[model samples]
Target: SAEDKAAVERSKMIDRNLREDGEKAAREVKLLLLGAGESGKSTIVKQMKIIHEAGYSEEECKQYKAVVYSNTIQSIIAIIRAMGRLKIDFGDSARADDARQLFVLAGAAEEGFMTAELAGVIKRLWKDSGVQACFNRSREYQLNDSAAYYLNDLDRIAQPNYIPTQQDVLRTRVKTTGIVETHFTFKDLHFKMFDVAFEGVTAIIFCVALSDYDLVLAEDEEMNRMHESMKLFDSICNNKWFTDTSIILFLNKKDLFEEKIKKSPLTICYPEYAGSNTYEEAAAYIQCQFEDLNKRKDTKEIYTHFTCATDTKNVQFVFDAVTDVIIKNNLKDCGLF
Candidate 1:
């Protein structure tokens, strides 16, 4: 009996040794992403999957297909509702009737919401100049950045049995109620990153949108998003919990900021922001706001990067740089040359 027991134990092997072996072999690292709602924080993670891994599986694409359809319907609904408050007319009179009926019908969340008939209505309404004009002023009502992308691509999106492309996946915005552990290889280093729903690690990538400056919080529209983010950052940067943690700050959404600055003045968020509302000036001022919050600026170094999270190439390059910084610092911490 004793000889049989010893043979069985040897065959099974110890789980702890395999796990520790995995830890060393993978050169595993944990990264936490922090940001306010709709800040495209998750977009960075998706970008990682696309860049490093084999992209989403067919099942995952199916998930985003459902997401895009809902996104299309809700975006149009929001715009139609906004037009009333903004007092803008539909560019076409027929759309007024369509808008009224939309309010009466079940929203996209319903079971039968994904239909060709409703798709036609969305396509027609999107074509109207008034809708486009309304979309331009969407900042007032806090519309999704993806509205224009979906609406404009209604042609293909309206097709039956249509699968969402990777871009559509990137453009889709569903709130992440929680966060995951994802691993990939970059620059010959295996990185296992975590999706922090906002651990939250080796480094913390705290994302703040440059365009979120003019928006308000999802939970409370009355709360200014920029201020909310600033205050939130102050708490984290100064917290003793993350004292030894390297902070990687991502000033995301450069593309939106460039265009938004042309319409909405930066002074709305930063009244003290005294500068021509050019893209450069506005971005610099916003960057400084968060950086100044680093009470431990002397000890805790916060690396900042301006990112357009939706753009693949842009994210690939920025993340590459981020990986380099993280790896070097980790090495330095371990007394590397």
Candidate 2:
């Protein structure tokens, strides 16, 4: 009976500590940068560092140079593959030899791949009328978001001493596989969280790329990328662990979304989406697609924001608004208001 009492009291003490810690974390509210893999979600954290943490160090910028190179080469390679798949041919026969050389070197990838010789090859193929056409049809296939950014800057990038700028690093894509955390203060308010995305998040920012509606996931070849991202959002919104957590929905990649809307039809993912394809109309339709998912009684809570995560000023503005929403919601959770 004494041991049972001890166990009961110990459990009580644990609950008290849990409540106490949660309250402490309320002021320090950590945020999760969640979304589809290609959603450029990590850019959200990168912007916080750029805005609040004073950006990356010299070594950090230098490291991304290789990433920029890899980005430039592989983007062309993907475009080439897409060409073959789509049955598009190069305008120049000379570039065919270059494409052949590129394919064999692709297996080994960047180490043997980076050279002044290869840089010219990339430059040549990039200018190829057929490759540009394939790149134009990028909406029909999968390409990393930053491919064009690096490819266009090949002359500067091919230099051995090439160093990446903050924007260059911003445009560089890396597959984020580990736990993510961001620490920063905005408007004198402390904000941070680490090592978790799904569990224990008091407020979760679910990011969705507004531009990817026309593409498909490259690895498994899903039917539609936008639908897949929405499916993931649905799972998160309805999950058991986050029942009481705030769902902050981020519709990011607006710049690319604007560019894509001028070209691709939104109906690729949303078949019945009717209306003229203006930015406001198309973007709102995509937002509606996400917002409608919460009509269910169990998962109806969510906050929505249209954002371009790469733009520091935009992220600053949207994230400030997000911070306000999160803090406002936290007060209710903590019963402090």
Candidate 3:
């Protein structure tokens, strides 16, 4: 009987770890700079190199390092000394362009809100940014019917009461990121981060916001539209592809809450819901959708981090939460520290 209990406990722990670890392993960090046409990437590289080379004290050299990609190199690479400092080469024009395109595609898919106009807009954005045919194909796979099919199943799993069908107006490829690999040392731990483009990442992030005490209001019709957006998010959380990635809620634009309040069917009438007025009520109502999703998908124990991404202070909260998820998953042990 004791052994049976131990086995059960072990099973629970492993399952718990699996869900959080998946999120940690899913973490992808990509750094980008904003500027004008033909802006000096080389200049940025030089600046970073100088900063790392000079700013890295001996202790930092032993703990953290930075790398810059040479113009000729086809791929970005990092070489770190015994110290944890990373020396990353950001790669060549072709590779950098490729990477940028991937970022754009993922951003568009995740934040673009899949309207009839968005597919064309995305295509133009990709083409203008010089996205290769291969990468283009990947985005298509992520945004098309295949992804929708997966989401349909996920919705059923997450919300059995509201079974989703292909006919359900939903947006696919709402968020995506490129898969990348990097190795760094944090303290004594070796960390390798895989930057994979998750097709529906925004949904997960938005769900966290809804659950927390935050609200965005609009007219009844507008609220309903947002409600549909939340459904799209629910579909993603229930999807198998996102089961492992950790979720961080960045309550972006907190200052705008007072300005956006309105009334509609979107408000939460359910006793379990929490929030301000009908608009806030609607926001809370959407949050319940995600809790249900997690319960149905058996991810109730997964950690959630709250933040306001638009605010610098709030952004730190997100990072801390990510760190928590990473530490809990033993990701540091896996070279992601």
Candidate maximizing TM-score: 1
lDDT of 2 at 327: 52
Worst lDDT run of 10 residues, candidate 1, spans 328-337
Q: Model-by-model lDDT, in order?
A: 0.78, 0.76, 0.32
Q: Mind giving the per-residue lDDT tens digits that candidate 1 earns over 59-89?
A: 7887788789778777888898899999999
Off by over 4 Å in 3: 1-223, 262-285, 295-297, 300-306, 330-337
Candidate 3 lDDT tens digits, 91-180: 233444444543454445522122333233333323332233232222112112223233223323223233322122211112223443
Scanning candidate 2 in windows of ten residues, the lowest lDDT window is 7-16
TM-scores of all predicted structures: 0.85, 0.83, 0.34
How are the candidates ranked when ordered by TM-score, highest leading? 1, 2, 3
**Residue-pair clashes per candidate:** 0, 1, 33
**Pairs that clash in candidate 1:** none
